[PDB]
Amino acid sequence: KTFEILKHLQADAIVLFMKVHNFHWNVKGTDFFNVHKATEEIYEGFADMFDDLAERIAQLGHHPLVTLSEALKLTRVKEETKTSFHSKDIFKEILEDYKHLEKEFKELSNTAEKEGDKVTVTYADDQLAKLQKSIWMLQAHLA
Amino acid sequence: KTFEILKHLQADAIVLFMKVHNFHWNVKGTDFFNVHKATEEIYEGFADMFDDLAERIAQLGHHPLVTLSEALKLTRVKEETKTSFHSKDIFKEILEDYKHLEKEFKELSNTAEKEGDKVTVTYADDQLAKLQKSIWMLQAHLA
Amino acid sequence: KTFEILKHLQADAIVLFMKVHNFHWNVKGTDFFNVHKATEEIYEGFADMFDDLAERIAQLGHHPLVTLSEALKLTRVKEETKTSFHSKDIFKEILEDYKHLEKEFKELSNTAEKEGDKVTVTYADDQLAKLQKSIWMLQAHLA
Amino acid sequence: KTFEILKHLQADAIVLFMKVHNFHWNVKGTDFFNVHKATEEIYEGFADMFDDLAERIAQLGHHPLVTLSEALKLTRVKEETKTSFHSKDIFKEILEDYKHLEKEFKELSNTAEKEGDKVTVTYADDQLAKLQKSIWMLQAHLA
Amino acid sequence: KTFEILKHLQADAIVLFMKVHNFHWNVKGTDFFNVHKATEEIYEGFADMFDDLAERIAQLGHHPLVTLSEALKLTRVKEETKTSFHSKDIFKEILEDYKHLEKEFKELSNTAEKEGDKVTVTYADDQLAKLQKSIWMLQAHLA
Amino acid sequence: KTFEILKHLQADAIVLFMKVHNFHWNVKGTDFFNVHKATEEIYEGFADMFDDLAERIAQLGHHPLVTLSEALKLTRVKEETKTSFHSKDIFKEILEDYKHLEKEFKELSNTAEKEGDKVTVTYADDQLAKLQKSIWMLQAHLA
Amino acid sequence: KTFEILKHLQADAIVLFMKVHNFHWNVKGTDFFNVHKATEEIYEGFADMFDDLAERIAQLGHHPLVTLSEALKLTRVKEETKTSFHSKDIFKEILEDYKHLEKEFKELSNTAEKEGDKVTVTYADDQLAKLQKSIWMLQAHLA
Amino acid sequence: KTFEILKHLQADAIVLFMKVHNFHWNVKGTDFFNVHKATEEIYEGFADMFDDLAERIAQLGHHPLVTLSEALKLTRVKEETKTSFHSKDIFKEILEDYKHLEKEFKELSNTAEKEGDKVTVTYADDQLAKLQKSIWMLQAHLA
Amino acid sequence: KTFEILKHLQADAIVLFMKVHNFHWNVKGTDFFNVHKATEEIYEGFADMFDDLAERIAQLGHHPLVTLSEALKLTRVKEETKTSFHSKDIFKEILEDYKHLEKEFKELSNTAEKEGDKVTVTYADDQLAKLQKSIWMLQAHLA
Amino acid sequence: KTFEILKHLQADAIVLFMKVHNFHWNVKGTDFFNVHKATEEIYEGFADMFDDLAERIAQLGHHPLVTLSEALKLTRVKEETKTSFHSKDIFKEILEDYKHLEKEFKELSNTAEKEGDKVTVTYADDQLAKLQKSIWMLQAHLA
Amino acid sequence: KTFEILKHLQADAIVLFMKVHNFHWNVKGTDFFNVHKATEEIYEGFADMFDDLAERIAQLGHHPLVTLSEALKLTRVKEETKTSFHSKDIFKEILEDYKHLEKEFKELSNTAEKEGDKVTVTYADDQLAKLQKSIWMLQAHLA
Amino acid sequence: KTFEILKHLQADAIVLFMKVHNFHWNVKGTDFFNVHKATEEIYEGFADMFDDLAERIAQLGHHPLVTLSEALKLTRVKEETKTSFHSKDIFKEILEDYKHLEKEFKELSNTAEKEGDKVTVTYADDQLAKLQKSIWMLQAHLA
Ligand SMILES: [Zn+2]
Ligand SMILES: [Zn+2]
Ligand SMILES: [Zn+2]
Ligand SMILES: [Zn+2]
Ligand SMILES: [Zn+2]
Ligand SMILES: [Zn+2]
Ligand SMILES: [Zn+2]
Ligand SMILES: [Zn+2]
Ligand SMILES: [Zn+2]
Ligand SMILES: [Zn+2]
Ligand SMILES: [Zn+2]
Ligand SMILES: [Zn+2]
Ligand SMILES: [Zn+2]
Numbered sequence A, B, C, D, E, F, G, H, I, J, K, L: 001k002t003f004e005i006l007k008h009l010q011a012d013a014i015v016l017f018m019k020v021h022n023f024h025w026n027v028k029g030t031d032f033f034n035v036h037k038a039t040e041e042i043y044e045g046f047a048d049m050f051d052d053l054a055e056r057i058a059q060l061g062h063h064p065l066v067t068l069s070e071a072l073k074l075t076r077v078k079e080e081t082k083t084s085f086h087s088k089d090i091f092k093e094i095l096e097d098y099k100h101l102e103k104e105f106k107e108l109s110n111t112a113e114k115e116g117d118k119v120t121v122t123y124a125d126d127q128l129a130k131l132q133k134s135i136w137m138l139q140a141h142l143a
């Protein structure tokens, strides 16, 4: 179900909002400003994704999740308890989670096509476009 | 300890970030736009508070919390599982949590004065100023 | 035919442009500013929809409609002759007409997919996205 | 009566809003961009005139017209059913309708002076100023 | 005399500047933000009216009033000592005072026409335009 | 005749454009910046007045003047051949020429009322408003 | 009591709002623009101070003053009935009243520290900062 | 293959970037400014298309082309060696090349649907939308 | 002498300021807007050139000209008494006068190099750059 | 000949436009964003240089080059076929090509001085200024 | 004494203004842009600190220092004569000097509390806030 | 040598940066704001001149000066130890130092022409242009 994948993704969005703030505060190295500013852009993107997924859920006549509790329960994103990083470790982690979201947005898109929910398709394909652009850029950082 | 109160408040900030999004999505009544836009301003404020508290913690040589897990563990904010509200219920809840943050920022301020951490004082008094302005406005909504 | 639905929708757009101005001028109640400003945003949206539908028609090698006469002839939107409203009546009427446009944009989208007119699809799905967001918000006003 | 002329003019404004969109979509010749952009400015002006006339009517304790139906009934503007133009034909038509509005705004102004409605006078003289500037520019196009 | 009415109006402007701040601080109800922001726009308008009337007086070779003392002495506006309101009470009061200013600006306009002071006429008619727009909007709030 | 006064004023506008540039370049004293910047605002105003008067003339079916030659022939403004000033001398000269334009705009306004040219009236009264504001400010400089 | 000093200062703010407008309209000399613009900045500052003091009072659970009447009753600011000034006289008067506000903001700050009202302290110290900057600048004008 | 069509289009984009600059520099006639500015907008669009196609190629794990050499080798766009034009000749040429890109973007879109590359579809349909709008406008210039 | 050429050019600048306004008001044809706006840019350029030449003269210890009288006396620009034009006639005239200014700025530049006035050289070469760009564009209009 | 060097440089500009896009897409390493953004600024500079050189050529009565074909024929810039880089390799390549352009702009400048083409001199010296600033910055990257 | 510490800090501010420009010009490595831009932000901050400290001194009735001579005499900042750096060396040096300013601003703050100079306290605590944020960021660069 | 004069001028720039701040803080008289703001513009100009001269030095393969120490050693600018001024004294001092910089920029320009350093010439002539404009304005203040 479309709204089930939406909920799952909403859960990842708020979890990544937090995870990315970790990287924002705890990066080390002459790389600090760039990663500090870039992580800020990343978590702000995730705050919007969170809101947008929730609002698609509501639009669709269902209930978005409303507690951090359900988010942790529905997410497939590993929270990061460590508190120190080189930029390369941050990019590897973010890349991993991006590849996860990419897979899921594809699923979201495929599922919504099947159920004749075209709006959810164009939302999912728009997010895929962004994820694939970032995936490429992150791959290029790490190469 | 100053950094202990900071951590506690950081936990409330991310919890209220979520709680306020609930109110953002699930308000009902001819009041919808105003509460939808106002809650958006409120949660954006909480996103900044979260970041700022975390960054004061780091500055002070300690570790801010880095998971939703610790946040739920350290918060004194009740998450809201209900998914429908009149504006009056939203304002009552927000008011309650504001009164909670007000008390704690006072504590933060008092404690930091004692430990000779003046920066943390001016941060705490700046946040008090905002909380007391909102507390007054919310009291005026409900009267 | 794609261009036939386009024409129909173009007719509704100019009719709603007028209808919404009625609500803009004739709302009553302590609700006045909010509804006055919101209706202004709504009719400005409809002015753009009108222009865009007409311009898709032209692009497609056909003729958009060019008189209020044809608009009244092609529309399924009831004009509103009454000249006084509470905000709730305005929202109910706007909701009704929105549900009408939603149905038709779905048709437009489905029909254009069939005829291999992909541009018209992405236009129709973009408008659906907006209509479904407003439909949800209006449902929330009225609940 | 002042409000009677206001209503008449309100009817012309919405009719010209449509008529001018015709010219916007259906101009032909190496003149296309200039006329396309200029007609867009013209119809946006007419959308404001429409709103302003309606709002003067309301202010004056009367009811502006609220349907395209009454507009077609009250207008002295010929709708244009043709769907192809050279720029010269567009300017001739617009000039004609401008000369019509000029005459009527003079009447509006004279009538409002008589009835001691000074606000309506300053509104009418402001619109005359604009019409006479455009009339001159259009005469210069055609010369 | 033109300058006598100017002085009277200048006195009302500063008195309403204060009166409107009362409403700004002391409104109660789920209406709070809207009335708080709208009253702020209203008193800022009155601050400009005050300055403009004073400056017309100076231009005309006379002396505007320069103390709150003369203002209270020359005003026909009742100061409001009460410190709590519903929005409806605020709108009724503002409406009353608006109707008062409307009457006086008409007088100002008529008197200035007689004395051949055309500048003061166009100033008075510009203010009438604004007062009549607000009077209509306030009537619509209360209906 | 309205257009005759317009032409006369157009001639003064271009003459004052030049005269004011003299003051702009040739002021002396610790007053230099203020007078340099203020004269720049003054001549830019005169450049617009020039254009606007010319364009009213054209609108009215007549020909504005098109050479400096006719301007010098039609102006009642004394050109200034001297090349050094204290600010007080500049203000006295500008004041004189302002009083001249004020008189003429009154004439323009009166004459246009008589001939039923309302647009030219509202133009003349708008310029009077500006001239009387500047006249007051200049009187205040010199007092 | 903190709120008692707040009220007193609120009274001075509205009185200085008026007093400063006097100086704004009635300054004489080649100094006119600078003093006209500077007084405009000064009274706009006082309008904000007025609003802010009133709003601190409300926040604190008390009632700000709501009439010009109480303002004149609570102020220690002498109103200025004279209607003509050299810039030096304006600066001397403003300086005097500034020194008065400086003393009182110190009192406000000291008193609020005692009562544990930290928000009011940071407000009072912020205003002191501004007053001491202006006091220095005004002393420099007069030296 | 999707990436093969992308590469082809990337080649056309840089070739049209140049071709359009030819028209930019070498248009003749009283049409000069309009065509000079419009061609500037057109080539800036092509510079972005070039970059975007290249970046989609990279995202997709392939290599965009990196020399003018490959571009000339992969393009189906005829370079223009002539150095003088009337606007009509420029529009005919641009129209031709647009019709070419339209065909190819359709192919791109169809092919990407087949291979399950949804991002490339939404990119191709977005570009089609723009090409069909320009095709219509250019047809209207030439009619 | 450098300052002699400066004065000559200053005279042409104010004469062209007027001449170009003629073209601004009196162009005829479907070309009207473009020429109306372009002439406005041209005369605004000439107003700046005028001011800049005058200010270079002053800088150099000499006196710029301060009357329209000297301008007409020092200019080699023919004033235009005719009051109706096709765009082609306007461009031919402007081109002629441009070729004149180009020649003179070359002279200015050469002369200033000789006298070791480098500032005047860089001013003259900057103006040449602009004149040669416009000369090319005007040649392209007329071809 | 001046125009011969201009043409040569125009050829390098479009070749570097492409070459720099290579570096834009194909940089690898934790350096990615900085080099991605900086290369974007560099190629945008080259797009302007290209246009400006072409337009100087036209101004000078000659024909700029109008095909990628002539560009490859006239350039002394080696195209880069490789598709992967560390930032250091990108900077070395860009530095090399910069040193090439620097030499040529000197030649351009010297040659134009000889032929009395001062405009082309000030253009060449302006570009030298930029090239020498970038050369220094690039040397500093590599040191 | 408060003003003695102010003077000392003023001396460091201008010395660091220079020192930081050294780092701005003489950094080496693929780090160049980031350090070049960041040092520019740092020295601009120091220019403001310098001005603000000087202006607090003046406000307090004392004399800020007015020569580079006294600055070198009063500073505890070592000037840097070396002319080449890796970014790590720049950050270590800046960190050292920051730790120095932090200590001194604490002293300033403590001393001003003692002397009842609250304005100087809030200034000192504001600067501490900034220094501690930068100290943390610099520590993070170097870790 | 070009770089020797550059260094000398760099030394004056930082010395004048300080000297001008003296005038900024210590001007007395009803002239205070104007001189306070103007000196702020002047020292900000000198901060840029300083940076630009240093960066030309680096570009040229030499080392700009990096301590206040060398600046005081290389400058021909007298530092000002006095701490109180009338505006006339400030303008006389600034004028003197300007005349000094003018002479030196001429030398810089002449020397750079000789050594074939054209970039340094265009930099020197640009600064001369500014110095001669300010010299004229300052002469006009003092006359
Ligand atoms: Zn941060
Ligand atoms: Zn951001
Ligand atoms: Zn939302
Ligand atoms: Zn997931
Ligand atoms: Zn750690
Ligand atoms: Zn490490
Ligand atoms: Zn929303
Ligand atoms: Zn927001
Ligand atoms: Zn942060
Ligand atoms: Zn808590
Ligand atoms: Zn529900
Ligand atoms: Zn309910
Ligand atoms: Zn309205």
Ligand SMILES: [Zn+2]
Pocket (backbone or CB within 6 Å): C040, C041, C044
């Ligand atoms: Zn709007």
Ligand SMILES: [Zn+2]
Pocket (backbone or CB within 6 Å): C051, C055, D024, D040
């Ligand atoms: Zn359109």
Ligand SMILES: [Zn+2]
Pocket (backbone or CB within 6 Å): C008, C009, C012, C075, C076, C077, C100, C101, C104
């Ligand atoms: Zn329909």
Ligand SMILES: [Zn+2]
Pocket (backbone or CB within 6 Å): C083, C084, D063
């Ligand atoms: Zn009714």
Ligand SMILES: [Zn+2]
Pocket (backbone or CB within 6 Å): C028, C086, E143
């Ligand atoms: Zn009702």
Ligand SMILES: [Zn+2]
Pocket (backbone or CB within 6 Å): A122, C122, H122
């Ligand atoms: Zn889309």
Ligand SMILES: [Zn+2]
Pocket (backbone or CB within 6 Å): C055, D036
């Ligand atoms: Zn369009």
Ligand SMILES: [Zn+2]
Pocket (backbone or CB within 6 Å): D040, D041, D044
């Ligand atoms: Zn528009």
Ligand SMILES: [Zn+2]
Pocket (backbone or CB within 6 Å): C024, C040, D051, D055
């Ligand atoms: Zn409206």
Ligand SMILES: [Zn+2]
Pocket (backbone or CB within 6 Å): D008, D009, D012, D075, D076, D077, D100, D101, D104
């Ligand atoms: Zn009519």
Ligand SMILES: [Zn+2]
Pocket (backbone or CB within 6 Å): C063, D083, D084
């Ligand atoms: Zn047709």
Ligand SMILES: [Zn+2]
Pocket (backbone or CB within 6 Å): D028, D086, H143
């Ligand atoms: Zn035709």
Ligand SMILES: [Zn+2]
Pocket (backbone or CB within 6 Å): D122, E122, F122
């Ligand atoms: Zn008016």
Ligand SMILES: [Zn+2]
Pocket (backbone or CB within 6 Å): E036, G055
């Ligand atoms: Zn407020």
Ligand SMILES: [Zn+2]
Pocket (backbone or CB within 6 Å): E040, E041, E044
């Ligand atoms: Zn406001």
Ligand SMILES: [Zn+2]
Pocket (backbone or CB within 6 Å): E051, E055, G024, G040
């Ligand atoms: Zn004022």
